[PDB]
Design a protein around this nucleic acid. Structure first.
Ligand SMILES: Nc1ncnc2c1ncn2[C@@H]1O[C@H](COP(=O)(O)OP(=O)(O)OP(=O)(O)O)[C@@H](O)[C@H]1O
Ligand SMILES: Nc1ncnc2c1ncn2[C@@H]1O[C@H](COP(=O)(O)OP(=O)(O)OP(=O)(O)O)[C@@H](O)[C@H]1O
Lengths: 334, 620
DNA sequence: ATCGATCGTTTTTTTTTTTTT
DNA sequence: CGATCGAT
């Protein structure tokens, strides 16, 4: 009962069976389900010669509603995924609990954060967006340079921060804006805007049929008194991000340039909120993520085109009532 | 002397003694006699050795050498002096007196890791590779001495018991018992002692943890050998200082059973060759190297080739990069008999839209002789501690670790101003001052600095006028070449960035077809090249350069003032003495590269066009 | 068993710098 | 100031 993997793990329908074990909580919301599903085990170091170490990292973000269930989405991640720590918004001043090393004070206890304390894993945030700007400063390298570097003690040593990042914040403006622009929805400074990722949002409008469907599901959920189990896929992802080490090959990597141009030409000063050369490479992260969801190690148009599917949906998500830019632009792509 | 095995004599008797007389190849080089004698001639008192010569000689010693090296490696010393003192005789008349010597060891076996230096790996020879932090001063140690009580040079195996009987007993029956020992250091000796240090690697279980480290030891010639912040290859040995298991349990509530302490002593440190792993202070470089150097300096196609050395995976920013390396060489510390030590090293600014590879670039400028990187929230008040042994107030004082190196930082914007001012100042006079506790030691050190930043409001500030910095213009003062970073659009630029990095980002791509580019090679070479070229040439101007540069700065200030008047309000950067005082250092960097001492103004029209970027940046 | 001559015996301090919220 | 240790 160990080939539990390879009695099943190679079917074509298993693109979506992973979604059924994210959080068995929500009727809707396939998108973030799939996004966290891929990003829980995706990753590649691909250290080229002496330059740098690229990423075992991503920052998916959902800036939704103050009270749509978001903070519950996070916990099953921890209850399956191998590492963590719990932290909520309003952490330290981002310094952390800068010591000088003496046998006075009996060693003047020592640490610098928690990405120092949990690398190549997770450690949790909730309800961030109403926190000290003096932390939104501080965490703003470890995400991408994946490197720490300190001073201001008896020492200037340095240490490794290879991680990813939880998101869990809260919007401003009451609940959530219309399709009117996003930079107006929550106001974070210019040199933080740099990185960005899996852009989803719990925008709400009322359907009574769906209200009936899910509410049946809810009361059914409240009616349990006394495809995948959590019994297994835990180990699938241990295996998947530990042992197999995927790749890429030239198949269609020029198409990426036309779509980046589709950003820059359809989006200049309307929506295109400095989404530089990190999210593009996050394209690759999705593709490599997909093939490790397959234990493939290479791929054809499939995985990359799935990345294009999801991104095409999202960037239509976060526009104006004029909401169909890449939609009209990609019926030919689609 | 139990002549059965492990004997005191057999080794020294002939074996080690004759190994070297016997060590032979024609060409009549291949001994260690020549090296020994010619070392002696210049006061060296050592020589270098392998550990896989025994395979060249035998099959027994080495698997006995590893076991009790502490003895074998002094039998080596004795054999060394007796086999060399025969040659100290030109005839019997010019050994005025013999002398003591130190042996070395080396190999290419394999480096280990600190996580395994364990109870099995003890009293045993080894190899590792770590990095250096700091280590002590130079205290003392010796080997033997006499005492008036007995008048015998007190001979020891270990590097203390002092028994009862008097030995000034020839006093009649009125003897002097109870240990009356008068140490006679007229009759003692003296060797060195330095306590080297060792941190572990940056990839070998620091991951879910922190890195540990280790402290060290030396005797005679490996002081003045290692400056800290360096990458070592090592052969040492893992041994203790104290001893005991039974219920004499230590201290007050210490030592459940038997815990004694670690350390290592060195038997044959060497260094690293990460390209040029260890090329920082000494010179084992050879005439071929220097020919190579000067003949590339002779090459008049070296600078533009060097514009393409940091960006083999990066596109663009070439006018930006015509002086990103000129920072490294430094100009001239043209000091004068009065105070005016006009500013030696060089400093740079850069700031603009993210997504433009500032972090990786500064990581690389660290990569390519000596440097460090933190950024904000925190290298270096300077540090006045208080010694937990004896409680004295010593000064660790860490721009000291750029005492000729350079510095790079971003995150000047994102750290508060309680700690900017000592460093606001250092980089105009290079003298770290101190006045805090009972000490007035105006320290100093020649560091430069690289300054990246982040403007809040991005290119909005850069479109219209004065929101350039958020903090002050007095550090708009100290820097010469200052660079916007924008990401202005163009689809050609877009696609070209697209494939340019993907062809990078694909399959760990460019191993074979990378270096086949022209001459853009070996940052190792640049470590060596830099540590050379700065260490010799002390140029300064030619006459024809001075007038045109002078008139150019004149017109610079006139144009700044006219933009002040062409807007009826101050539209300028302050036309400082610092601007010329720095462009002089840009000329100096150029002449440092090509090694021609006297530099002409065509050499520096390049400088003119590069700081013109700063001029036309703060033009608005 | 008793006495005496043998052996070996040591402890005293208060305060300043940078750091974090 | 204490215990060891030797002989008487
Ligand atoms: N599909 C669902 N299944 C179960 N519970 C749901 C679902 N949708 C919404 N909820 C409920 O909505 C509530 C949302 O509150 P929660 O504890 O998630 O704080 P939050 O929504 O993260 O708010 P904030 O982050 O603004 O503090 C939860 O109690 C959750 O049970
Ligand atoms: N023009 C480019 N060509 C190739 N690679 C690039 C380019 N621009 C960025 N990259 C890659 O994108 C990443 C940029 O991250 P980096 O830490 O430089 O951000 P940054 O530009 O410093 O932004 P900030 O200054 O706000 O931190 C790097 O890993 C770099 O390799």
């Amino acid at each position: 009962d160990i080939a539990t993997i390879q009695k099943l793990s190679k079917d074509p329908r298993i693109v979506e069976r992973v979604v059924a074990s994210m959080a068995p909580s929500i009727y809707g919301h396939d998108y973030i389900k799939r996004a966290l599903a891929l990003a829980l085990f995706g990753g590649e170091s691909k250290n080229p010669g002496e330059k740098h170490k690229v990423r075992g990292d991503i920052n998916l973000l959902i800036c939704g509603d103050p009270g749509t269930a978001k903070s519950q989405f996070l916990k099953y991640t921890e209850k399956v995924a191998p590492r963590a720590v719990f932290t909520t918004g309003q952490g330290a001043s981002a310094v952390g609990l800068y010591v000088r090393r003496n046998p006075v004070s009996r060693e003047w206890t020592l640490e610098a954060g928690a990405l120092v304390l949990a690398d190549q894993g997770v450690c949790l945030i909730d309800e961030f967006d109403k926190m000290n700007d003096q932390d939104r400063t501080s965490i703003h390298e470890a995400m991408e340079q994946q490197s720490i570097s300190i001073s201001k003690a008896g020492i200037v040593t340095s240490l490794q921060a290879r991680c990813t990042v939880i998101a869990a914040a809260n919007p401003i403006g009451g609940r959530y804006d219309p399709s009117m622009t996003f930079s107006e929805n929550v106001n974070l400074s210019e040199p933080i805007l740099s990185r960005f990722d899996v852009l989803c949002v719990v925008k709400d409008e009322f359907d009574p049929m769906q209200d009936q469907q899910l509410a049946k599901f809810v009361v059914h959920s409240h009616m349990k008194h006394h495809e995948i189990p959590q019994d297994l896929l835990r180990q699938y992802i241990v295996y998947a991000k530990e042992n197999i080490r995927p790749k890429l090959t030239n198949i269609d990597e020029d198409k990426i340039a036309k779509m980046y141009a589709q950003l820059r030409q359809e989006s200049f000063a309307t929506g295109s909120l400095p989404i530089t050369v990190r999210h593009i490479e996050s394209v690759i992260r999705m593709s490599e993520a997909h093939a490790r969801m397959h234990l493939r190690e290479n791929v054809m148009e499939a995985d990359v085109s799935m990345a294009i599917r999801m991104m095409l949906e999202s960037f239509i998500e976060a526009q104006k009532f004029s909401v169909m830019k890449k939609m009209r632009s990609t019926f030919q792509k689609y | 002397n139990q002549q059965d095995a492990q004997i005191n004599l057999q080794a020294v008797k002939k074996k080690y003694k004759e190994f070297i007389r016997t060590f032979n190849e024609e060409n009549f080089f291949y001994k260690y006699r020549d090296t020994l004698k010619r070392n002696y001639l210049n006061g060296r008192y050592f020589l270098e050795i392998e550990m896989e010569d025994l395979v060249g000689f035998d099959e027994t010693l080495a698997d006995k050498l590893n076991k009790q090296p502490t003895e074998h490696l002094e039998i080596f010393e004795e054999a060394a002096r007796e086999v060399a003192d025969e040659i100290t005789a030109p005839r019997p008349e010019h050994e005025e007196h013999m002398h003591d010597i130190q042996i070395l060891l080396s190999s290419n076996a394999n480096p280990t890791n600190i996580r395994q230096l364990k109870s099995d790996c003890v009293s045993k020879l080894v190899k590792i590779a770590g990095i250096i932090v700091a280590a002590s001063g130079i205290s003392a140690k010796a080997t033997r001495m006499s005492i008036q009580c007995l008048s015998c040079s007190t001979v020891i195996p270990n590097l203390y018991a002092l028994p009862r009987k008097c030995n000034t007993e020839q006093a009649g029956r009125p003897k002097c018992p109870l240990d009356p020992f008068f140490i006679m250091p007229d009759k003692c000796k003296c060797v060195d002692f330095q306590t080297l240090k060792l941190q572990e690697l940056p990839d070998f279980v620091p991951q879910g943890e922190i890195p540990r480290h280790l402290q060290l030891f030396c005797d005679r010639s490996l002081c003045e050998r290692v400056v800290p912040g360096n990458r070592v290859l090592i052969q040492g040995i893992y041994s203790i200082r104290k001893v005991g298991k039974p219920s004499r349990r230590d201290g007050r509530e210490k030592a459940v059973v038997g815990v004694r302490a670690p350390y290592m002593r060195v038997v044959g440190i060497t260094v690293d060759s990460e390209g040029a792993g260890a090329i920082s202070r000494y010179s084992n470089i050879t005439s071929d190297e220097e020919e190579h150097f000067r003949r590339m300096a002779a090459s008049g196609d070296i600078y533009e080739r060097l514009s393409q050395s940091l960006a083999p995976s990066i596109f663009g920013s070439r006018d930006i990069k015509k002086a990103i390396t000129c920072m490294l060489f430094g100009g001239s510390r043209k000091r004068l008999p009065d105070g005016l030590c006009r500013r030696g090293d060089i400093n740079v600014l850069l700031l603009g839209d993210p997504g433009t590879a500032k972090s990786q670039l500064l990581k690389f400028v660290e990569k390519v002789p000596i440097a460090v990187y933190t950024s904000g929230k925190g290298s270096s008040t300077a540090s006045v501690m208080k010694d937990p042994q004896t409680r004295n107030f010593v000064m660790e004082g860490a721009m000291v670790l750029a005492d000729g190196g350079v510095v790079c930082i971003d995150e000047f914007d994102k750290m508060r101003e309680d700690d900017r001012v000592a460093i606001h100042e250092a980089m105009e006079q290079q003298t770290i001052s101190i006045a805090k506790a009972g000490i007035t030691t105006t320290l100093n050190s020649r560091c430069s600095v690289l300054a990246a930043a982040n403007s809040i409001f991005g290119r909005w500030d850069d479109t219209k006028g004065e929101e350039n910095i958020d903090f002050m213009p007095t550090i708009l003062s100290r820097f010469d070449m200052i660079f916007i970073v924008k990401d202005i659009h163009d689809e050609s630029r877009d696609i070209t960035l697209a494939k340019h990095i993907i062809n990078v980002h694909l399959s760990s791509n460019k191993s074979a077809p990378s270096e086949p580019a022209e001459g853009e090679i070996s940052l190792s070479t640049f470590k060596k090249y830099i540590h050379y070229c700065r260490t010799h040439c002390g140029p300064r101007l030619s006459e024809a350069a001075g007038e045109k540069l002078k008139s150019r700065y004149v017109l610079m200030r006139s144009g700044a003032g006219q933009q002040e008047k062409a807007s009826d309000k101050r539209l300028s950067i302050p036309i400082t003495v610092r601007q010329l005082e720095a462009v002089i250092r840009i000329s100096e960097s150029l002449a440092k590269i090509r090694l021609q001492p006297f530099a002409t103004d065509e050499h520096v029209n390049e400088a003119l066009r590069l700081f013109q970027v700063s001029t036309l940046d703060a033009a608005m």
